[PDB]
Design a protein around this ligand. Structure first.
Ligand SMILES: Cc1cc2nc3c(=O)[nH]c(=O)nc-3n(C[C@H](O)[C@H](O)[C@H](O)COP(=O)(O)OP(=O)(O)OC[C@H]3O[C@@H](n4cnc5c(N)ncnc54)[C@H](O)[C@@H]3O)c2cc1C
Length: 474
């Protein structure tokens, strides 16, 4: 026969899926597939929490396909070899999938498509994870943006796309078809343990399309009205917690935008309206960094701006280790690193703090931090993670004047009652917020909690010194 294969990667859902929907309009004999790529799975940069969330999403996706009328095929190996072989064995009319913004995915995709074309099989690659593709947002000169402000002005004025239809009444493969591909398929979805991973720390939102959709609806029904200023406080559960759902596409970007938009239209309060606009802004920042990675792939290599490619990083391994173990001696920093390693997620204000600390205070090539985050974030995303770390030094997009966060000021400002500190550092619940914020804790009262590993004031001067010396040297 002539079926269409839809290749899932970061769009683990059946609803509001551009590529899937396009494929369904061409054929009801729509068969989904997912390929466990060893280059990604065996990577030292893969986070156990991310594999757990992923596996959970795949489990639901298998059911969704089964309920729709067909199935989700599972494979383990090199994509440019296995996918074309599968398509050929199935005499596929075509293979569809949604475009990636990352160097690895785009290179791989080019190879799969070329392999498919050689086999005379049509490959269709459409945009799905962004409200607007990188090619849609350009300046009057037709160039990409490296400054947020102007990018937002353009992005904001663009007509927003709406959710597409969930495919239904699919036609499943026949025994003869199944026999032709048997050798390329895994008999069942491997469990996290079978893959060699273990995770028991939970998630910001349970895995799966259904849970993602439920969270979006719950958030936009209430919490979103207070997004601003609730978003600023790690102690408050003021954010959506949809990050992993967006990274793996458990939820569609158009559904997210539409839900927020409907909440804005339903609200009759100025403050709520503003809170919702602010949340929508977050989605814009998301596209700013994804577009940037797409337009400037070298960003993924490390410090982007020339000056920073030459920064004299001290790189004291011991300080890094202490940072990764939440033993810096800075309560606000340690409480954040603990939440990360224990739950695979961290409040954005905290990511900003620990990143600033690692780069400015510990003076360690921020790539070590970017890597550590990727090794632990359930929402670990190259575009966003790299954007965040380039941000800790203004070494990439949207650069700002040299600045160094003062852990104490941030803690006092965003966790005034030290509620968040105490939460993730229970062995310090007896200490007074006052001291947990200043980071000056008396030895006895400090019990086993380590003392500050660096003197902020001395580190601050050291960093500025190196910066200026290099700035001048240039
Ligand atoms: C050093 C550092 C590293 C980061 N690492 C990542 C990462 O690997 N993966 C990840 O998706 N985000 C990253 N962020 C951005 C951010 O912290 C999160 O998206 C956020 O914590 C997710 O929680 P939420 O879903 O409740 O966010 P909400 O506040 O509810 O925001 C909704 C959505 O907007 C997007 N978003 C929000 N903040 C930004 C932003 N600053 N940049 C890009 N997208 C944004 C996310 O997709 C998020 O789910 C990083 C930030 C820093 C400073």
């Amino acid at each position: 026969a002539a079926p269409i294969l839809f290749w899932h990667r970061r769009d683990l859902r059946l609803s509001d899926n551009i590529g899937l929907a396009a494929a369904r309009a061409q054929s009801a004999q729509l068969i989904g597939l997912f390929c466990l790529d060893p280059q990604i799975l065996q990577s030292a940069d893969m986070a156990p929490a991310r594999v757990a969330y992923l596996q959970g999403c795949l489990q639901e996706l298998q059911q969704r396909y089964q309920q729709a009328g067909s199935r989700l095929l599972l494979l383990q190996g090199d994509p440019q070899h296995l996918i074309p072989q599968l398509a050929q064995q199935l005499q596929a009319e075509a293979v569809y999938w949604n475009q990636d913004i990352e160097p690895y995915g785009r290179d791989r995709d080019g190879q799969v498509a070329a392999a498919l074309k050689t086999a005379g099989i049509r490959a269709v690659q459409l945009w799905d994870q962004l409200l607007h593709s990188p090619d849609q947002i350009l300046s009057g000169s037709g160039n990409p943006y490296s400054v947020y402000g102007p990018f937002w002005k353009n992005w904001q004025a663009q007509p927003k796309p709406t959710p597409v239809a969930t495919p239904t009444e699919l036609v499943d493969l026949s025994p003869e078809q199944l026999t032709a591909i048997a050798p390329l398929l895994l008999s069942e979805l491997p469990t996290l343990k079978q893959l060699g991973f273990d995770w028991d720390g939970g998630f910001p939102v349970e895995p799966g399309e259904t849970a993602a959709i439920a969270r979006l609806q719950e958030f936009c029904d209430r919490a979103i009205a207070d997004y601003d200023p609730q978003r600023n406080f790690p102690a408050e559960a003021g954010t959506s917690g949809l990050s992993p759902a967006l990274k793996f596409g458990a939820i569609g970007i158009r559904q997210a935008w539409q839900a927020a938009s409907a909440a804005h239209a339903l609200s009759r309060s100025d403050e709520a309206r503003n809170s919702i606009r602010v949340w929508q802004q977050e989605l814009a920042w998301r596209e700013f960094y994804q577009h940037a990675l797409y337009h400037f792939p070298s960003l993924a290599d490390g410090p982007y701006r020339s000056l920073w490619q030459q920064f004299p990083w001290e790189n004291r391994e011991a300080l890094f280790t202490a940072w990764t173990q939440a033993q810096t001696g800075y309560p606000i920093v340690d409480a954040a690193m603990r939440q990360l390693t224990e739950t695979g997620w961290m409040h954005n204000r905290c990511r900003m703090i620990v990143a600033s600390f690692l780069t400015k205070d510990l003076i360690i090539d921020w790539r070590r931090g970017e890597q550590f985050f990727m090794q632990h974030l359930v929402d670990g995303d190259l575009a966003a993670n790299n954007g965040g770390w380039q941000w800790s030094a203004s070494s990439g997009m949207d650069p700002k004047p040299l600045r160094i966060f003062n852990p104490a000021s941030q803690a006092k400002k965003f966790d005034a009652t030290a509620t968040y500190i105490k939460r993730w550092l229970p062995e310090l619940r007896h200490v007074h917020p006052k001291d947990l914020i200043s980071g000056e804790i008396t030895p006895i009262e400090r019990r086993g909690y380590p003392a500050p590993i660096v003197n902020h004031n001395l580190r601050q001067k050291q960093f500025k010194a190196l910066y200026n010396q290099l700035k001048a040297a240039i």
